[PDB]
Amino acid sequence: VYTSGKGSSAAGLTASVQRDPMTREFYLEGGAMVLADGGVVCIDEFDKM
């Protein structure tokens, strides 16, 4: 997963808890790390995060 950020554009850069608007509850919203798990992650502007 190539993410140069700050995360982008909608995608957060890290594991994040966001709630399902319906049913409420909780779920992993997604991000670079989680979706990319068990492999390579590519980051840019790493000082700009």
């Binding site: 982008s8 554009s9 979706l35 502007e45």
Partner: protein, 325 residues
Amino acid sequence: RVTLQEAPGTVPPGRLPRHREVILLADLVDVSKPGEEVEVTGIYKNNYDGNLNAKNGFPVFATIIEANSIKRREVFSWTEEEEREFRKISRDRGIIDKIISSMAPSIYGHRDIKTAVACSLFGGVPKNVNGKHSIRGDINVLLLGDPGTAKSQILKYVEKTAHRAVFATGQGASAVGLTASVRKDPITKEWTLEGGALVLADKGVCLIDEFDKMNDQDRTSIHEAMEQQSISISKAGIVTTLQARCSIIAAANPNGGRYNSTLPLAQNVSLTEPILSRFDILCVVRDLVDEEADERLATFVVDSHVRSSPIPQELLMKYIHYART
């Protein structure tokens, strides 16, 4: 169904234009597009549903124009005779200059700042190296303006001429708003995905102005778009990478005065150097008062307001599409 409202041009002062509801059937469907004054020749009816046993007082029936026909305001493509004709025009060398001169008529502009426009608007080659990286096939024009300079109006031209051209303004916003996000729908409806200006404008031309006024949340989006040529969206459950290949044309406003310092451009304006590096062509505009230049300009402006060689606009706006395809 088409909600048709009174054309805002002809309004008598103080009264508001009134929604009136139109129905389309058969071949009429989907022909009309929003943001266009349309004509219908209908049969005005007070139907229906109609109960409306809810009202009660006073007895009141809604009205609906049931439409028979549609007339456009008051669809373009190249064609065999038109292209065989066409080819012979592109053969002269000076056609370039003629085109540039045709590119922004009412501004009086510059030869340079229009040249950039023509160049980026007209195209590039993508161009994928087997099988890895496509480089980029577009020209990103940073048009760095100056208060009172034409810097807005120019790009507005591009929205009329280009095939797919989108106006996102800065933010705040004039829809669309530059950031793809999955948003709950108006009234009560299921959640629809929506792209920013970038996704919407793919292969076309994305037109943005006043970078400096943009909230970082957008800035990262534009940066990403230029960088990898794709916008990724991870929310909510929907997870993708949409592909925006757009050429960005920008209008920017120097920090403070017309020319803020002898100091370098990057110092001259707020936008950070790395985002700027992505832009290949930088159009600076000037200048200090010039006698003749003020003559030449004022005559032109005055000429305009008093009113009350280049290719015909139609053939150029066909020309571009033709060649790009």
